[PDB]
């Protein structure tokens, strides 16, 4: 299974209105990723910290997976997730994660300063740590901090899709990726492609070749894209859907009804799962003996 968790959405502020051309290009790139081959795609939405969060709940998510992606999935055959990246540099008093975290699925951060990095590593409840590979690194990253963070949770994310933008950004991207891999001890690394058009997408072999040329072994790339991507999807999904890892709202019967896999069945305006009666008290306990 292959997971791409950083598909950008053509909108940065809530004052912006997305035209139909951008939605058509996104549909085209989703079809492109599906045709060659992919399993999980989670589109990204980026906002800054000093902005004014709207005091709404039903308007925080301009993604509407049921409206247009509901038009696309029945023909495509894959699932989409909504994620948000927080551009936090200065610890201002604007902090309303109690709404956007529960409204969205995955919550990431984009630190630029040292104090913001420290607070996002200690107190901020996030899922992935993304750095500005376009700009310069804030400081000399420490080892113990990143190790304690990946042991506590949040892992780092590397986006090879930004190196396809221009020429002058490739050197900075490689310099940042080298430092991240050297300081993170190659444990909590999740790879993603931040492409806005289907023309800047690649195959899994190109991805593993690029990362093995960067310095990370190919088997580790395969493992981090197979198990670690599924785990970072699962964590961010059940931290918002379910309670604090004690009670799950989804019951896996076979091999397809999974809290991250089953997305059309589980209700979202609420958290209930209305299923017909399939568990009685007169049926034989042993499944090998139980017959209908």
């Amino acid at each position: 299974m292959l997971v791409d968790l950083n598909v950008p959405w053509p909108q940065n502020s809530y004052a912006d209105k997305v035209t139909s051309q951008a939605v058509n290009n996104l549909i085209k790139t989703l079809s492109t990723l599906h045709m060659l081959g992919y399993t999980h795609i989670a589109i990204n939405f980026t906002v800054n910290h000093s902005e004014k969060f709207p005091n709404d709940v039903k308007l925080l998510n301009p993604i509407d997976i049921k409206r247009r992606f509901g038009e696309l999935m029945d023909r495509t055959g894959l699932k989409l997730y909504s994620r948000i990246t927080l551009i936090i540099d200065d610890p201002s008093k604007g902090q309303s994660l109690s709404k956007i975290s529960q409204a969205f699925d995955i919550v990431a951060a984009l630190p630029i300063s040292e104090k913001g990095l420290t607070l996002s590593t200690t107190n901020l409840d996030i899922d992935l740590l993304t750095f500005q590979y376009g700009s310069r690194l804030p400081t000399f990253l420490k080892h113990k901090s990143i190790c304690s963070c990946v042991n506590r949770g949040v892992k780092l994310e590397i986006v090879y899709g930004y190196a396809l933008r221009d020429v002058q950004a490739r050197r900075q991207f490689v310099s940042n990726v080298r430092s991240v891999i050297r300081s993170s001890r190659s444990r909590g690394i999740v790879i993603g492609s931040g492409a806005m058009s289907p023309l800047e997408c690649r195959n899994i072999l190109g991805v593993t070749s690029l990362i093995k040329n960067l310095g990370l072994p190919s088997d580790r790339c395969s493992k981090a894209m197979g198990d670690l991507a599924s785990l970072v999807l699962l964590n961010g999904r059940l931290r918002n859907k379910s309670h604090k890892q004690t009670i799950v709202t989804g019951g896996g019967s076979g091999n397809g009804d999974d809290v991250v896999n089953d997305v059309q069945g589980i209700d979202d305006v609420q958290t209930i799962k209305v299923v017909k009666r399939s568990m009685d008290a007169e049926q034989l306990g042993h499944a090998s003996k139980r017959h209908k």
Partner: protein, 145 residues
């Protein structure tokens, strides 16, 4: 943890390219004719820019991107033409090949670059430089006779 550094010692040697003049064949005579002096238009940012241009011109884009992460000139003075280039233990071969492929300075021509000592610390580099400077004086004293 430790950042693995590897300093590079290089020398700028000027071959006496003059076919119209006859020359003396000896040890100290050619040592003096090759270690004459560096021109005035010689500094740290003028050599760093030249080596950065040559790195991109020979290796390419990714070859310069991987090498320019810790490419700095720590110590260099134009009186003796001795410089210490810091780099990674991974990209030492790249910096050495670039110093070999150095063609000329943008305004000064007719010169070669010789990598002498490569080590992972500055103290041993300084000790080897002092030993080489002491060795240089011996042939000079012997030839002054």
């Amino acid at each position: 943890v430790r950042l693995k550094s590897r300093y590079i010692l290089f020398e700028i040697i000027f071959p006496p390219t003059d076919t119209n003049v006859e020359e003396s064949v000896s040890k100290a005579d050619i040592l003096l004719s090759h270690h004459r002096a560096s021109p005035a238009d010689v500094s740290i940012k003028s050599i760093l820019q030249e080596i950065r241009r040559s790195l991109s011109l020979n290796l390419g884009d990714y070859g310069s991107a991987k090498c320019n992460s810790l490419l700095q000139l720590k110590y260099f003075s134009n009186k003796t033409s001795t410089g210490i280039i810091r780099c990674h233990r991974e990209d030492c071969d790249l910096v050495i090949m670039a110093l070999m492929l150095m063609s000329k300075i943008g305004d000064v021509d007719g010169l070669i670059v010789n990598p002498v000592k490569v080590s992972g610390t500055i103290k041993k580099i300084e000790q080897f430089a002092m030993r080489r400077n002491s060795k240089i004086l011996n042939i000079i004293k012997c030839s002054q006779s």
